[PDB]
Amino acid sequence: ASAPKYIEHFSKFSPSPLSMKQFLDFGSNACEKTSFTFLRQELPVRLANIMKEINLLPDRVLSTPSVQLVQSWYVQSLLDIMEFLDKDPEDHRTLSQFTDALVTIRNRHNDVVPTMAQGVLEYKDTYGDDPVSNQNIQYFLDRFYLSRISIRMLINQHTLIFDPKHIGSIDPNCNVSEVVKDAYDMAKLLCDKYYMASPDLEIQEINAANSKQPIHMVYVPSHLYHMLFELFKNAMRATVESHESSLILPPIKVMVALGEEDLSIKMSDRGGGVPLRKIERLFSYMYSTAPPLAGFGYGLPISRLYAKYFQGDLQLFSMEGFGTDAVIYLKALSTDSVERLPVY
Amino acid sequence: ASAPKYIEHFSKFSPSPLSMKQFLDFGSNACEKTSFTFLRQELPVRLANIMKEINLLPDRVLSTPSVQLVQSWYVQSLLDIMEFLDKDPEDHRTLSQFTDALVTIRNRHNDVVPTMAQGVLEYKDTYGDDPVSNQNIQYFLDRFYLSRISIRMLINQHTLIFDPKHIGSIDPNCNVSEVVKDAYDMAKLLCDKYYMASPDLEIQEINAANSKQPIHMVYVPSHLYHMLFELFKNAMRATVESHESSLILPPIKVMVALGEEDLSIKMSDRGGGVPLRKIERLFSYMYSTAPPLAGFGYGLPISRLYAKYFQGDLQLFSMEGFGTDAVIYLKALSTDSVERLPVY
Numbered sequence: 001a002s003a004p005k006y007i008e009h010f011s012k013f014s015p016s017p018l019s020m021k022q023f024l025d026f027g028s029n030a031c032e033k034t035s036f037t038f039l040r041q042e043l044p045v046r047l048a049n050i051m052k053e054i055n056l057l058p059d060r061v062l063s064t065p066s067v068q069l070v071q072s073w074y075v076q077s078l079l080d081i082m083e084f085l086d087k088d089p090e091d092h093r094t095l096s097q098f099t100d101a102l103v104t105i106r107n108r109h110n111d112v113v114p115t116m117a118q119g120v121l122e123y124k125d126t127y128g129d130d131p132v133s134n135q136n137i138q139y140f141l142d143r144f145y146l147s148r149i150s151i152r153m154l155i156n157q158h159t160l161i162f163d164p165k166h167i168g169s170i171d172p173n174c175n176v177s178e179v180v181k182d183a184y185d186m187a188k189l190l191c192d193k194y195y196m197a198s199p200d201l202e203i204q205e206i207n208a209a210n211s212k213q214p215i216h217m218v219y220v221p222s223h224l225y226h227m228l229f230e231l232f233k234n235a236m237r238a239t240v241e242s243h244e245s246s247l248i249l250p251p252i253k254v255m256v257a258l259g260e261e262d263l264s265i266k267m268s269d270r271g272g273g274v275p276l277r278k279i280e281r282l283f284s285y286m287y288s289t290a291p292p293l294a295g296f297g298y299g300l301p302i303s304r305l306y307a308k309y310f311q312g313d314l315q316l317f318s319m320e321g322f323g324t325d326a327v328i329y330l331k332a333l334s335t336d337s338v339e340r341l342p343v344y
Numbered sequence: 345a346s347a348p349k350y351i352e353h354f355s356k357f358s359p360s361p362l363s364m365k366q367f368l369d370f371g372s373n374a375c376e377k378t379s380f381t382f383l384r385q386e387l388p389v390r391l392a393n394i395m396k397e398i399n400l401l402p403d404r405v406l407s408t409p410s411v412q413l414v415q416s417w418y419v420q421s422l423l424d425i426m427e428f429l430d431k432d433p434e435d436h437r438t439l440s441q442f443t444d445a446l447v448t449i450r451n452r453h454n455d456v457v458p459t460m461a462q463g464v465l466e467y468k469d470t471y472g473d474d475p476v477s478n479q480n481i482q483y484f485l486d487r488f489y490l491s492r493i494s495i496r497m498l499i500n501q502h503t504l505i506f507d508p509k510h511i512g513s514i515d516p517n518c519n520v521s522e523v524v525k526d527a528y529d530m531a532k533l534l535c536d537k538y539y540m541a542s543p544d545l546e547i548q549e550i551n552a553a554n555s556k557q558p559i560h561m562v563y564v565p566s567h568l569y570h571m572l573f574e575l576f577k578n579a580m581r582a583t584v585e586s587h588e589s590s591l592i593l594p595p596i597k598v599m600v601a602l603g604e605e606d607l608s609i610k611m612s613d614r615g616g617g618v619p620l621r622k623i624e625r626l627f628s629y630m631y632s633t634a635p636p637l638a639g640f641g642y643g644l645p646i647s648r649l650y651a652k653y654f655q656g657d658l659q660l661f662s663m664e665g666f667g668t669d670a671v672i673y674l675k676a677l678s679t680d681s682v683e684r685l686p687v688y
């Protein structure tokens with residue numbers, strides 16, 4: 001077969017980050033043929049870039065069953081996409097079987113996270129969990145997961161639009177507060193199920209330039225939901241367990257600020273907090289992988305990748321003895337919301 | 345002369361970080377001879393370590409008048425200290441002229457900050473202000489200033505004690521709130537002088553393990569004052585200028601938390617804040633050097649060195665459109681308060 005030639009050829013290209021605008025433009029008025037011709041070039045570049053990095057991992061990592069299985073998904077997905085390079089954009093059955101091919105590729109990779117998690121486990125027990133190992137895992141998974149988010153975003157844009165308010169997974173009129181409430185509601189439901197107390201929510205908005213207006217943005221609200229949900233679940237765990245022997249339960253307080261450049265979402269809790277020393281660990285794939293609410297959500301590392309993905313960030317800071325603020329930093333202006341892709 | 349042999353010899357040694365305990369022990373019951381024999385070894389190691397680093401700077405930096413002048417102070421101070429190596433600890437005139445020598449050395453170096461500032465200016469205008477330059481300046485000055493804080497601390501411990509509550513510059517019973525109030529009071533005074541409005545203060549304490557108790561610690565309260573004062577001055581500037589056309593002026597809110605491991609001091613303002621993109625810049629010697637309240641205080645970079653100096657930190661996070669939290673993280677337990685010295 002040809003996977004290594006394909007990988008080599010296509011990793012000579014640089015991925016092409018898209019902006020929100022570019023996304024919205026692909027997504028109306030059936031630009032279908034256009035999405036197609038972009039994607040058949042772009043997905044291989046993206047796939048191959050990460051595949052090259054996978055192949056450069058040391059052999060004692062690369063020969064593990066978990067990496068072998070993922071190496072195998074990428075090869076197959078890259079080949080499935082190949083089939084279409086020389087095919088004819090005007091032929092509607094071409095467009096059709098390409099959408100089928102996208103769905104199948106998306107399915108094939110649904111379980112990477114737990115797959116990678118086993119590889120981390122194997123390596124931790126097999127070579128150790130020293131700081132150097134940790135940085136290398138962190139470095140590799142951040143890139144790899146960031147890479148993964150970007151590909152799933154391309155595929156979802158195409159399959160949702162090519163099967164009027166929403167544009168695939170982008171809401172050009174996202175109501176930030178609405179998403180905060182829904183993710184709160186869902187985390188509370190879980191909370192009340194496993195603890196039979198749950199804190200209230202208090203939302204405050206600060207729309208600097210327009211005192212009055214509800215705060216809206218162009219965003220991928222499924223992403224924003226992932227991040228809010230992870231954050232609520234942690235804050236609820238903290239708050240509830242830290243107040244078992246007490247009567248008053250602090251609310252969880254969220255602030256939504258709209259500046260010239262940032263849209264920031266702070267979520268404050270009084271769960272007793274974490275010492276500065278132990279904070280980075282929460283972001284570590286290595287330390288946050290071991291063999292109640294613990295089962296739910298995308299995790300802090302991935303939540304932060306979602307924020308970084310459109311040039312934002314997710315940060316924590318705590319006051320041990322008191323509680324923790326978690327802030328999601330997003331770009332307020334759609335013209336600043338451009339894909340951030342691992343550097344090659 | 346012998347400066348380069350001395351530098352080489354003494355940079356073969358590693359500085360010896362001291363803990364609060366070690367500091368308190370030198371500082372009572374006249375351990376004077378002991379402080380003397382420690383210092384005559386330790387100061388040269390410390391001086392020489394930084395001097396070695398100064399000599400490794402590229403020539404286009406090293407040949408500048410500002411660096412030449414500082415290179416010259418260190419040489420002289422290292423030599424003044426040399427005079428004592430073979431001298432006799434039992435002779436009281438020895439002890440005496442050594443204290444004189446310490447005072448003189450401290451004076452000789454009083455003006456490094458503005459000296460270094462001219463070197464940064466020269467280099468910025470002479471070679472540019474690109475990101476690489478910036479990291480190298482940051483790296484060098486952090487180390488150099490951290491080095492400087494540690495030496496001044498040794499000298500001040502000796503000269504204050506060898507000329508009962510306080511122990512030189514260490515207060516084994518520092519009242520954190522007291523220092524917050526005093527630095528607030530001083531920053532307000534300045535504020536009212538240049539603006540004729542100034543925000544109020546609100547202090548809240550959270551003593552996790554002892555709900556009741558005022559929060560106390562073993563610290564160098566002059567340091568804690570430097571950091572609180574810089575932070576108040578910024579928060580007052582922000583708050584006041586951001587509310588000129590408005591009637592209500594938010595207070596500046598400080599929280600003092602005492603955990604198992606951290607003592608944290610958060611100072612919150614509603615000055616409108618800073619976008620995430622521009623935050624690191626506030627810590628940059630390069631960008632925060634250009635040719636009202638602006639004249640006062642030690643600066644953010646040095647304030648953070650003071651916090652790092654005893655294994656703590658100083659961090660900022662803002663919500664553009666709203667305001668800024670600044671948190672000083674200190675070690676709650678004196679057994680964790682050990683000098684952090686630049687690595688060699």
Ligand SMILES: Cc1cnc(Cl)nc1-c1ccc(N(Cc2ccc(CNC(=O)C(F)(F)F)cc2)C(=O)c2ccc(O)cc2O)cc1
Nearest residue numbers: 231234235237238241242269271272273274293294324326
């Ligand atoms: C990482 C994580 C994953 N899943 C779940 Cl359910 N929780 C966490 C989690 C949650 C809170 C924390 N802590 C530390 C913490 C841990 C446990 C507790 C509960 N208290 C106790 O267990 C105690 F035993 F002391 F009583 C409080 C705080 C925080 O301070 C915190 C961190 C992130 C965040 O977004 C929000 C936060 O509040 C750490 C881990």
Ligand SMILES: Cc1cnc(Cl)nc1-c1ccc(N(Cc2ccc(CNC(=O)C(F)(F)F)cc2)C(=O)c2ccc(O)cc2O)cc1
Nearest residue numbers: 575578579581582585586613615616617618637638668670
């Ligand atoms: C670094 C510094 C040094 N000296 C002085 Cl007097 N001030 C500052 C300073 C202060 C505040 C900021 N800003 C940004 C800022 C700058 C200006 C203003 C005032 N508003 C305006 O000038 C406006 F023009 F928009 F109205 C508000 C915020 C902050 O958000 C902030 C930073 C650190 C800190 O500890 C506290 C802070 O509040 C930046 C620089």
Ligand SMILES: CC(C)c1ccc(COc2ccc(CC(=O)NCCN)cc2Cl)cc1
Nearest residue numbers: 057058061116119120123132133136137140
């Ligand atoms: C399965 C995934 C999560 C995973 C598991 C484990 C790893 C571990 O990766 C390491 C560990 C140590 C070193 C230093 C070193 O030895 N360098 C020289 C090259 N051998 C390099 C790498 Cl790439 C990465 C990704």
Ligand SMILES: CC(C)c1ccc(COc2ccc(CC(=O)NCCN)cc2Cl)cc1
Nearest residue numbers: 401402405460463464467476477480481484
């Ligand atoms: C005066 C103080 C504040 C000061 C002023 C200026 C500097 C600047 O230092 C630089 C700038 C660029 C580089 C890259 C490079 O050229 N590397 C190869 C070696 N030439 C290295 C260094 Cl050490 C430091 C400290």
Ligand SMILES: [Mg+2]
Nearest residue numbers: 026035157158
């Ligand atoms: Mg598309």
Ligand SMILES: [Mg+2]
Nearest residue numbers: 314315316317
């Ligand atoms: Mg963080």
Ligand SMILES: [Mg+2]
Nearest residue numbers: 370379501502
């Ligand atoms: Mg001493």
Ligand SMILES: [Mg+2]
Nearest residue numbers: 658659660661
């Ligand atoms: Mg910071």
